[PDB]
């Protein structure tokens, strides 16, 4: 199938409490594999998946050198943006940056992305064509113009089409047993009485990978979107994911209701019924 590698960076100013916090994480599909935290003791990029622990000191030194350079540009960025928005020196602000690339099921370059936010809203993004920029504010046009003059999109495109996907494929190979796995959901239902005339039917999907899943209820084969409580897919902590979907079923109607599960790990979708 399709795959992705994505790096997520957060910088948060702390006026009067020293340097800004900087946190970097890297993911392949839904699996975290590296972190850096400026507040941690080591001051190194660090492994978070077992398959990347096999990369030698050259890798770790170079990723540490680069992540610290990212930390320093974001430090300057916080000051620059505060000047752009005429903000005071007292308040805490947030920059977020995300970039990375997708390959399709032929493993070739599909999509490349790079975006940047200030205080939780879009600031600038690379367009789909990887040649131009979308600037939100009037402040972001200064950045757009800076970046156009320094030909950043050219340099970025080269990374996204070249380095980014080459290393993605390397990681997919090296971590084959983790990243090219699917864990099918293990499914069950629970039934709990609201009162005498209705009961909650909850359809569970546990221990699945990757995170993408469709969990729906139907009544007489008609979908119940409007009447289903659906929770956000949530991490189990062990690299798998959990989700549930519940509906309120009037007395005697359990047989009308079917829960439907779609996941890449399943040989065919499941149709579950309380019976």
């Amino acid at each position: 199938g399709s795959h992705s590698m994505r790096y997520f960076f957060t910088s948060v100013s702390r006026p009067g409490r020293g340097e800004p916090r900087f946190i970097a994480v890297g993911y392949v599909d839904d699996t975290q594999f590296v972190r850096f935290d400026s507040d941690a003791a080591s001051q190194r990029m660090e492994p978070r998946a077992p398959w990347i622990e096999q990369e030698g000191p050259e890798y770790w030194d170079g990723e540490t050198r680069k992540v610290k350079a990212h930390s320093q540009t974001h430090r300057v960025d916080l000051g620059t943006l505060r000047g752009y928005y005429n903000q005071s020196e007292a308040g805490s602000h947030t920059v977020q940056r995300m970039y990375g690339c997708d390959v399709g099921s032929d493993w070739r370059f599909l999509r490349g992305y790079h975006q940047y936010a200030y205080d939780g809203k879009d600031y600038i993004a690379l367009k789909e064509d990887l040649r131009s920029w979308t600037a939100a504010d009037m402040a972001a046009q200064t950045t757009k113009h800076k970046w156009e003059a320094a030909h950043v999109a050219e340099q970025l495109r080269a990374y996204l089409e070249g380095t980014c996907v080459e290393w993605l494929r390397r990681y997919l190979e090296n971590g084959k047993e983790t990243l090219q796995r699917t864990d099918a959901p293990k499914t069950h239902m629970t039934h709990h009485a609201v009162s005498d005339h209705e009961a909650t039917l909850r359809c569970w999907a546990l221990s699945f990978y990757p995170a993408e899943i469709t969990l729906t209820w139907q009544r007489d084969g008609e979908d119940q979107t409007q009447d289903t409580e659906l929770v956000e897919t949530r991490p189990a902590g062990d690299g798998t994911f959990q989700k549930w979907a519940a509906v309120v079923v009037p007395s005697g109607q359990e047989q009308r209701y079917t829960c439907h599960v779609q996941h890449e790990g399943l040989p065919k979708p499941l149709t579950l019924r309380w019976e």
């Binding site: 992540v67 350079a69 340099q155």
Partner: peptide, 9 residues
């Protein structure tokens, strides 16, 4: 692998 060629806003 990270991009090595960052730029200021």
């Amino acid at each position: 692998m990270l991009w090595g060629y960052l730029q200021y806003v």
